[PDB]
Design a protein around this nucleic acid. Structure first.
Ligand code: ZN
Ligand code: ZN
Lengths: 193, 230, 114, 209, 385, 276
RNA sequence: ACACCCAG
């Protein structure tokens, strides 16, 4: 049972005998990605300040972060802080990036990996900004009247309070356990959730 | 075995009929030369040979593709034995000759194995990077990133990617699985409608297209599968 | 300590001994280019590998949300109270269990190991 | 080195003198318990081209059962012993009409010399050792039980008792370190006494093949 | 049948009340875990700054892992001993552990106090993510909670991080169960098809199929393993002064012999000189008895395996004949010596009058005749038995 | 600890801080600063050491921390070079009190492969397959006082009681028995190893059977479970019946003088029947 | 033949 099976592969359910550990089952909230075209993401990146791969010289790569779209090197960027703030905002607003697309920043290596292809396994998580949930009380009261209101889970994702996070993005996420604890004023464990 | 710190970039192009092709780039044990395991090639070739086959023949262009910063000497030290191994080859054409001479199908003339080696260097080498006549600079940058990931792990600068990490895994649901059947099944239907139409036009009857296509290939192929498990 | 590249055929220089003056002579062994150097060093190897880890730490790591932050150790040339600390945890570093601190202020990539 | 070599030469002499005593050969008690400084005073302390030369430790001992059945112990100078040096020691054995002899070789022998040890095997018994193999006694080890070589008359008594054939006994290789220590050839039976934690003493027999 | 039908009256059960500890025990468990957590935090702080000296034989990281595991194992043992200290005699978890029917003392500690440190592949929970065990922790966290220590018990309930780490040690136990079984079954197959034809022949020599002697007697003594028991040799542990006192029949000190032997028996012992020579011959043979066992047993382990239980069938003879140990006996010491000598000749393993057969017979039953002469000596039979 | 320092394999990979190669032809001037003082001291016409030597210079320095923890000196290294390489190499050592503990290596004078890569190739030979002191194939050696009688020695006093003393026991990593037993101040009676193969080729066939019984009893009785000695003795006498270690695999059981029908019921079924 | 599954 590997450490990264948290939340999308059941740690308990497993058959006995010769098959143990090899036949696994999805968790309750696990959603396998269906796949999408990488053309809108590549069109957005070339529109942005990202320089093309053939355009640059092999000398500015060292002080820049490589961009990977579906595992293919497509160029470099010089402002990785603004790119993740733009890319994560566009996924939460559901403007051009489908919510199943996962973007991972490896800061210690200076790599950016955007994955779009099918086969990825994702689960939904809430969004914490400045140690506060974006899931306010007005979302619960709207969801408590789920019928005769045309409000459902899809409106919750489009409101920017729930993202889909796969295992490979979970390398660089700091995940709160439960909002009841760990998100208040005490002896601080981590102040950036 | 002889391989220590092997590499793996199992790659397949999106919505392409050809399956995945492995381009294992391995480093030899002390008992430090970097070799490659190109598809449709029997035994291994040095990594500087395939760099010179790709178009960039000077050592400045090769090391600019692999070594992004020349200040550190450590990564320049372990690429030194690879350059010494490839001292014999000095042109692009002779690099293509060396690749084609080790292929699965040995050619007869010099131009025969050069064309065959250029075909595997372009169409079966990293199809996800690009399969086109002029998509060779992108391939060498990815092959430059191939060795750069290998030299960092030999130095221990980044941790080796373990196989059992589940972010390094994908799940084939009924979508990609049935599309894999419909890949060759539509290819098999298009192949047979080609020979049926050719048989009726060689002798000059022309053909009626609605009776040329049988509803038997897609129907049996998708019903024998999903039932037998094959 | 470092080898320059050829000005004629863009290959890599290599040491060579000459008998006319007995001086270090980096000579490209592909073409016939000649060059006299002044570094007078061919090969150095860090056997105990005391590589300065402070240079290889990327200064942009301080904005990672998954790294701990403490105000106990302030920045030296910046004066900011809180900073990001972590271990290298890499090969060729012997024990590799001693803290490296990176300041979290923008436009200050000062790294101290204490 | 000088002190390390004269300690090594003394210790390898005490082991091979114990090897002769374990075979039934006439060995006095003085030569067995040879103290190190007694060896230094009697022979020398600087063996690096000095008084205790390599060709000086030759040991002549005789059988207690038969006085004219004697032994040579040889320490050749060369680290590798070859056909020519072997032929010299064969002339020495021809001159002094003694069959059995031991050649303590420092750093192994030539492949041709190895084949010439067994060339005159049923005329001259010539067995060999490395210097490091005879440097320490292996019989004194607690893992090695006390081997006893038993005579052919006692073997025939044994086979008539247990109604056994020669090949039905357990086997020990001729190249075994204990087998080379006692100088046994093929066809002899070695009586082996062991302490057991369930019966006490237990005697088993092994044939050399 | 009798116990089960009494168990219908007494009854036996287990429940929640057999796991609840009082408020003092829970406060003591929480204090020990809090102190152990502070001890681990102190070690990490002493290891972050270069202040931890590496122990010889291992690197600093393995020194740190050994020190943390030592503290956490001492925490589990201390909280374990605190939990079972406050278990009443009516507690049914204790009632089936001290009887050994099912469960053990570590199971009560896991139920009541703490589950403990949970290991996968020997070491602790590895860094499956980038330097993190789970996304809920910080990077480079070598603390107990992050690396797998479970501060909760089964009764209190595991936290979700501790539940996932419990599913890892549980899985690793299941992977070990499947892999070991497939390997040991092949070890078992190979181990016996090599020697399935080995049989004790009718001349009591262990031989294989092609009639080659493997052992001259089975197990070097000719005794099957069904009728052998664990015994103690009485002439291996005591020193020379203690052995001479407790195993030599003193022909002097006539007052002691009047207490132990009858009047006609003590008159024969003192007057005769041949009996004193035989008793001295017993003791000098018992000194060679001791010197042989010093060679065979250098570690002093006197717990050996022998067929007849000498210390028990003597106790059988005391009870079936109603022997009073206070009154003096009427057993002649020379009758003991002749009796043991006749018994030693009557037990044969290697049969035959040949000198080779007689030597093998003496060696096969050597250790039993050591124990027979030690236990059935004249001094012990006249004083203790 | 003196036995520890002289049994253990010590190489230049464990004592040298970093190494370098230079070119400076004349000994009277070198590029490195803190060298020319004791170079001129050691070059006051030292006979053969000043000659028609090649200009290539190998400069290696040893870290003081590992040097003090291993207790060597430049004198031991110098004659180790002069015995390993002979007159083919010239070695120059510096004073001990210097902070930069510099050791200088140069090649012999009358020297088709050039010296720019010969000195590279021999430098790799010095730091891979050169022994400073100790014997090879020994990775580490440990020390610990025993507390149980498994490894603790037991003597008999004058009173005769079994006294359990506390000696020092060395446990190694990697096996080489023929020279550890050969070493001075090492007990040649109780010294053993866990390697079955080397015990057989050094101590004999009965010793390897006794060692087989010891390690087989140790692997089983560690859990506290008991198994009778008769089953241990029967396997150890079957496996060492023929004078060689008859391994319990197809390669040892199907190679003895038994009949072919239970050979083919064991393993290799068709191939044994072909051979039969 | 393959999958699934029972017991240790
Ligand atoms: Zn050039
Ligand atoms: Zn700062």
């Amino acid at each position: 049972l590997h450490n990264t099976l948290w939340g999308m592969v059941c740690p308990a359910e497993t058959p006995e005998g010769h098959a143990v550990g090899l036949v696994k089952n999805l968790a309750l909230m696990a959603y396998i990605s269906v796949g999408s075209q990488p053309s809108p993401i590549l069109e957005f990146l070339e529109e942005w300040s990202m320089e093309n791969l053939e355009e640059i010289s092999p000398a500015a790569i060292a002080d820049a972060t490589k961009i990977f779209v579906n595992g293919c090197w497509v160029g470099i960027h010089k402002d990785p802080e603004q790119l993740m703030n733009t890319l994560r905002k566009l996924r939460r607003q559901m403007d051009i990036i489908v919510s199943e697309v996962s973007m991972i920043r490896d800061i210690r290596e200076r790599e950016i990996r955007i994955y779009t292809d099918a086969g990825r396994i994702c689960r939904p998580l809430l969004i914490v900004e400045k140690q506060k949930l974006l899931l306010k009380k007005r979302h619960i009261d709207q969801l408590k009247e789920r019928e005769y209101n045309n409000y459902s889970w899809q409106d919750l994702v489009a409101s920017g309070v729930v993202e889909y996070i796969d295992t490979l993005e979970e390398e660089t996420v700091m995940l709160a356990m439960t909002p009841d604890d760990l998100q208040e004023k005490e002896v601080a464990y981590c102040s950036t959730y | 075995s002889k391989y220590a710190y092997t590499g793996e970039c199992r790659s397949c192009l999106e919505n392409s009929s050809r399956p995945t092709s492995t381009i294992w780039v391995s480093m030899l044990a002390r008992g430090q030369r970097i070799v490659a395991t190109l598809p449709y090639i029997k035994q291994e070739v040095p990594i500087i040979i395939v760099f010179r086959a790709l178009g960039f023949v000077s050592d400045r262009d090769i090391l600019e593709h692999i070594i992004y910063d020349f200040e550190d000497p450590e990564m320049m030290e372990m690429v030194k034995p690879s350059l010494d191994e490839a001292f014999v080859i000095q042109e692009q054409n002779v690099a293509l000759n060396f690749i084609g001479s080790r292929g699965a199908k040995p050619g007869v003339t010099k131009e025969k194995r050069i064309k065959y080696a250029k075909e595997v260097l372009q169409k079966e080498m990293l199809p996800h990077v690009g399969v086109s006549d002029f998509c060779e600079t992108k391939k060498a940058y990815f092959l430059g990133y191939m060795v750069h990931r290998l030299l960092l792990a030999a130095l221990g600068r980044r941790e080796l990617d373990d196989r059992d990490h589940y972010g390094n895994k994908r799940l084939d649901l009924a979508g990609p699985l049935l599309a894999f059947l419909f890949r060759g099944m539509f290819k098999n239907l298009l192949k047979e409608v080609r020979i049926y139409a050719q048989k009726f036009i060689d002798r000059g009857k022309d053909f009626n297209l609605e009776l040329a296509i049988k509803t038997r290939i897609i129907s049996d192929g998708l019903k024998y599968s999903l039932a037998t498990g094959n | 300590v470092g080898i320059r590249f050829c000005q004629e055929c863009n290959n890599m220089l290599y040491p060579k001994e000459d008998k006319e003056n007995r001086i270090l002579l980096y000579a490209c062994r592909n073409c016939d280019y000649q060059q006299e150097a002044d570094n007078s060093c061919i090969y150095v190897n860090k056997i105990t590998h005391e590589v300065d880890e402070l240079t290889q730490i990327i200064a942009d790591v301080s904005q990672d949300p998954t790294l701990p932050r403490t105000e106990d150790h302030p920045c030296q040339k910046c004066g900011h109270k809180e900073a990001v600390f972590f271990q290298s945890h890499s090969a060729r570093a012997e024990d590799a269990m001693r803290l490296y601190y990176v300041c979290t202020a923008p436009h200050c990539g000062h790294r101290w190991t204490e | 080195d000088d002190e390390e070599e004269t300690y090594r030469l003394w210790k390898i002499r005490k082991t091979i003198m114990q090897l002769c005593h374990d075979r039934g050969y006439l060995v006095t008690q003085d030569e067995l318990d040879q103290t190190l400084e007694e060896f230094k005073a009697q022979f020398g302390d600087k063996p690096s081209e000095g008084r205790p030369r390599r060709t000086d430790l030759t040991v002549l001992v005789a059988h207690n059962d038969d006085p004219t059945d004697q032994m040579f112990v040889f320490f050749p100078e060369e680290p590798k012993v070859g056909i020519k040096t072997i032929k010299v020691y064969c002339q020495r054995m021809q001159e002094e009409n003694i069959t059995r002899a031991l050649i303590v070789v420092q750093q192994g022998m030539t492949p041709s010399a190895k084949q010439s040890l067994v060339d005159m095997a049923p005329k001259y018994i010539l067995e060999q050792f490395l210097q490091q193999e005879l440097l320490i006694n292996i019989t004194e080890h607690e893992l090695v039980p006390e081997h006893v070589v038993m005579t052919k008359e006692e073997v025939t008594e044994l086979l008539a008792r247990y109604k056994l054939r020669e090949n039905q006994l357990p086997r020990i290789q001729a190249g075994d370190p204990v087998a080379r220590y006692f100088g046994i050839k093929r066809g002899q039976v070695v009586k082996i006494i062991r302490p057991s934690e369930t019966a006490g003493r237990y005697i088993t027999y092994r044939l050399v093949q | 049948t009798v116990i089960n039908n009494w168990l219908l009256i007494e009854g036996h059960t287990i429940g929640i009340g057999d796991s609840i500890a009082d408020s003092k025990t829970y406060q003591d468990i929480q204090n020990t875990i809090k102190k152990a957590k502070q001890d681990v935090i102190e070690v990490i702080e002493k290891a972050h700054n270069n202040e931890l000296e590496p122990t010889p034989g291992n690197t600093l990281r393995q020194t740190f892992e050994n020190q943390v595991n030592r503290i956490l194992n001492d925490a589990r043992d201390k909280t374990g001993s605190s939990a079972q200290k406050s278990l009443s005699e009516y507690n049914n978890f204790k009632s089936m552990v001290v009887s050994g029917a099912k469960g053990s003392k570590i199971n009560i500690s896991q139920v009541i106090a703490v589950v403990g440190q949970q290991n996968v592949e020997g070491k602790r929970i590895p860094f499956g993510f980038k330097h993190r065990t789970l996304p809920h922790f910080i990077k480079d966290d070598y603390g107990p909670e992050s690396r797998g220590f479970v501060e909760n018990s089964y009764l209190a309930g595991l936290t979700p991080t501790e539940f996932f780490f419990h599913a890892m040690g549980g899985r690793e136990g299941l992977i070990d169960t499947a892999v070991k079984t497939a390997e040991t079954g092949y070890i078992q197959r190979r181990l016996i098809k090599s020697m399935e034809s080995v049989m004790v022949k009718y001349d009591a020599t262990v031989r294989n199929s092609i009639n080659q002697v493997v052992q001259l007697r089975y197990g070097e003594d000719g005794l099957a393993g069904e009728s052998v028991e664990f015994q103690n040799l009485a002439t291996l542990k005591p020193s020379n002064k203690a052995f001479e006192k407790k195993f030599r029949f003193d022909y002097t000190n006539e007052r002691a012999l009047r207490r132990t032997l009858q009047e006609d028996l003590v008159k024969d012992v003192l007057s005769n000189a041949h009996i004193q020579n035989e008793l001295e011959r017993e003791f000098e043979r018992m000194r060679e008895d001791r010197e042989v066992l010093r060679v065979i047993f250098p570690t002093g382990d006197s717990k050996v395996v022998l067929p007849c239980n000498l210390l028990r069938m003597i106790w059988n003879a005391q009870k079936i004949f109603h022997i009073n140990p206070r009154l003096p006996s009427d057993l002649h010491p020379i009758k003991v010596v002749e009796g043991v000598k006749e018994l030693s000749k009557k037990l044969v393993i290697v049969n035959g009058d040949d000198p080779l057969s007689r030597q093998a017979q003496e060696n096969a039953t050597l250790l039993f005749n050591i124990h027979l002469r030690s236990t059935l000596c004249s001094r012990r039979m006249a004083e203790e038995f | 600890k003196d036995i520890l320092c002289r049994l253990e394999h010590t190489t230049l990979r464990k004592v040298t801080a970093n190494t370098a190669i230079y070119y400076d032809p004349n000994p009277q001037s070198t590029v490195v600063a803190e060298d020319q003082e004791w170079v001129n001291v050691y070059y006051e016409m030292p006979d053969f050491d000043v000659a028609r030597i090649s200009p290539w210079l190998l400069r290696v320095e040893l870290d003081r921390k590992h040097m003090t923890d291993r207790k060597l000196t430049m004198e031991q290294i110098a004659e180790k070079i002069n015995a390993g390489f002979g007159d083919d190499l010239n070695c120059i050592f510096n004073d001990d009190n210097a902070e930069k503990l510099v050791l200088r290596i140069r090649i012999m004078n009358s020297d088709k492969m050039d010296d720019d890569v010969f000195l590279r190739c021999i430098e790799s030979n010095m730091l891979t397959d050169m022994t400073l002191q100790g014997i090879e194939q020994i990775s580490k050696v440990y020390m610990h006082l025993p507390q149980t009688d498994n490894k603790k020695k037991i003597i008999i006093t004058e009173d005769g009681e079994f006294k359990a003393l506390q000696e020092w026991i060395l446990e190694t990593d990697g096996v080489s028995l023929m020279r550890v037993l050969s070493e001075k101040d090492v007990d040649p009676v109780r010294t053993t190893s866990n390697d079955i193969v080397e015990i057989f080729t050094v101590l004999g066939i009965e010793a390897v059977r006794k060692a087989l019984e010891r390690e087989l009893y140790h692997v089983i009785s560690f859990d506290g479970s008991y198994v009778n000695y008769r089953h241990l003795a029967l396997l150890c006498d079957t496996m060492t019946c023929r004078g060689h270690l008859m391994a319990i695999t197809r390669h040892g059981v199907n190679r003895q003088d038994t009949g072919p029908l239970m050979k083919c019921s064991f393993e290799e079924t068709v191939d044994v029947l072909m051979e039969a």
